[PDB]
Amino acid sequence: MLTYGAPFNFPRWIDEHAHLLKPPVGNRQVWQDSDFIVTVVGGPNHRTDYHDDPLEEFFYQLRGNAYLNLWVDGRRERADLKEGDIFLLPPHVRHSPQRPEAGSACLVIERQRPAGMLDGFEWYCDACGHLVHRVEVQLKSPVTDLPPLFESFYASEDKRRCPHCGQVHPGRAA
Amino acid sequence: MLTYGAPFNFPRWIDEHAHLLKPPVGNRQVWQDSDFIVTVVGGPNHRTDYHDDPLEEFFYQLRGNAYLNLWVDGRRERADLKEGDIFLLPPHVRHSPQRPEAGSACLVIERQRPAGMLDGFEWYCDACGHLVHRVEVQLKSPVTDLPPLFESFYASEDKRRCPHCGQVHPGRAA
Numbered sequence: 001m002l003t004y005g006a007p008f009n010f011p012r013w014i015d016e017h018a019h020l021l022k023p024p025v026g027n028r029q030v031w032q033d034s035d036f037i038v039t040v041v042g043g044p045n046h047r048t049d050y051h052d053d054p055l056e057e058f059f060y061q062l063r064g065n066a067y068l069n070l071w072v073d074g075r076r077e078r079a080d081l082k083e084g085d086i087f088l089l090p091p092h093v094r095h096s097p098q099r100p101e102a103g104s105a106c107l108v109i110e111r112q113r114p115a116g117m118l119d120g121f122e123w124y125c126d127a128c129g130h131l132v133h134r135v136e137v138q139l140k141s142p143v144t145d146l147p148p149l150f151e152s153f154y155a156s157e158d159k160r161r162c163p164h165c166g167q168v169h170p171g172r173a174a
Numbered sequence: 175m176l177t178y179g180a181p182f183n184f185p186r187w188i189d190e191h192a193h194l195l196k197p198p199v200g201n202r203q204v205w206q207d208s209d210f211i212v213t214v215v216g217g218p219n220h221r222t223d224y225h226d227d228p229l230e231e232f233f234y235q236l237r238g239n240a241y242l243n244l245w246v247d248g249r250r251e252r253a254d255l256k257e258g259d260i261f262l263l264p265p266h267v268r269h270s271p272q273r274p275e276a277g278s279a280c281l282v283i284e285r286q287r288p289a290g291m292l293d294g295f296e297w298y299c300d301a302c303g304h305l306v307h308r309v310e311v312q313l314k315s316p317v318t319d320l321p322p323l324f325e326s327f328y329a330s331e332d333k334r335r336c337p338h339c340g341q342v343h344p345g346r347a348a
C-alpha cells in the first residue's frame with residue numbers, strides 16, 4: 001500500500017500550513033510514522049540550545065533565509081541557509097538553528113533514531129565557551145518531548161550555571 | 175568538520191549539471207560517502223525494471239513532470255510526480271520511474287543500505303503480469319553496478335522468458 005498517501009503539491013501544502021509555520025508552533029511534520037522524518041520549519045524563531053544528532057540532517061531552505069550556529073573544530077561557526085540553499089549536516093556536529101524571518105520555510109529531513117541511539121541537547125557558556133548542561137533523550141516525539149526538556153533548563157539556575165566560570169546562562173534568550 | 179561542505183544554491187547546481195541530467199548519464203548524486211543518498215534525476219528516460227527498495231524513498235519533482243509505475247495491492251498502478259509534487263514511497267513498494275521530459279529534475283533521497291540488506295530489481299510479463307526475473311544486489315555503487323545487471327537481463331532470452339505463459343519480455347524498451 002501507499003502508506004503515506006499519494007504525491008501532492010508542496011508549495012500549496014506550505015501555503016496551507018502558514019499558520020503553523022510561525023510562533024508558537026513553528027514547524028510541521030509532513031508524514032507520520034515514517035522512517036524519514038520530513039519537516040517544514042518556519043519562523044521567526046531563535047534558540048540557545050545546540051542539537052547533537054547521532055544521524056545526518058538534510059536542509060533545503062525553500063523560502064527566506066536562516067542560519068545554523070555551529071561548533072566546528074572546537075570553534076563557534078555559522079552556516080548560512082540562504083534562500084535556495086541545500087546542505088547536509090554530518091552526525092554529531094552541534095547545531096542551533098536561527099530563523100529570523102517570518103514567512104520563511106525550510107525543508108528538513110532526518111531519520112528516526114533506533115532504540116538506544118540517543119540525541120543530545122546542550123547549552124554553552126557565552127563567557128568562556130564551556131559546556132554548561134547536556135541532556136540525552138530517546139527522541140521519539142520531538143514536538144511534545146522537547147518543550148519540557150527545554151523548559152526544565154530555563155527553570156533551573158543550577159542547570160544554567162557554568163561549571164568553569166560560574167556565569168549563569170540566560171536560558172531561553174541569548 | 176563539515177564533511178559534506180558548506181550550504182550551496184540548489185537551482186544553480188542543477189543548472190550547472192544540466193549536461194548530466196539527460197542521456198546517457200541521467201542522474202547525478204549530490205554528496206558522496208554520506209548516509210543520505212541525495213540524487214537529482216533528469217530526463218528523458220524510460221525503463222522496464224521495477225525497484226524493490228528495502229528502505230523508503232523521498233521524491234520532490236522540482237522541474238517538469240514524471241511518473242512512477244507501481245505495483246499496489248497486486249495491481250499495476252501509476253503515481254504522477256507533477257512539477258512541484260513531493261512523495262514518500264514506503265519500503266518494498268515495487269516502482270519503475272518514467273521521466274519523459276527533457277529538462278526535468280527530481281530530487282530523490284534514499285539512505286545507504288547496510289550490509290546484508292539487499293535491493294531487488296525485477297521485471298514483469300506484459301502479457302500475464304507474472305514476475306519474469308528478479309536479481310538481488312548489495313547496492314553500494316548503483317551508478318556503476320546497475321548497468322551490468324540490467325544489461326545481463328536484456329542479453330538473455332532465458333532471463334526474459336516468462337515462467338507462466340512463455341512470452342519473452344522485450345528487454346530494454348516496453
Ligand SMILES: Nc1c(O)cccc1C(=O)O
Binds near residue numbers: 039041098
Ligand atoms: N533542523 C530542524 C529539525 O530537525 C526539526 C525542526 C526544526 C529544525 C530547524 O532547522 O529549525
Ligand SMILES: Nc1c(O)cccc1C(=O)O
Binds near residue numbers: 280
Ligand atoms: N528514484 C531514483 C533513484 O533512487 C536514483 C536514480 C533515479 C531515480 C528515479 O526516480 O528515476
Ligand SMILES: [Fe+2]
Binds near residue numbers: 053095
Ligand atoms: Fe537537528
Ligand SMILES: [Fe+2]
Binds near residue numbers: 125127162163
Ligand atoms: Fe563559563
Ligand SMILES: [Fe+2]
Binds near residue numbers: 225227231269
Ligand atoms: Fe528506487
Ligand SMILES: [Fe+2]
Binds near residue numbers: 299300303337341
Ligand atoms: Fe507471462
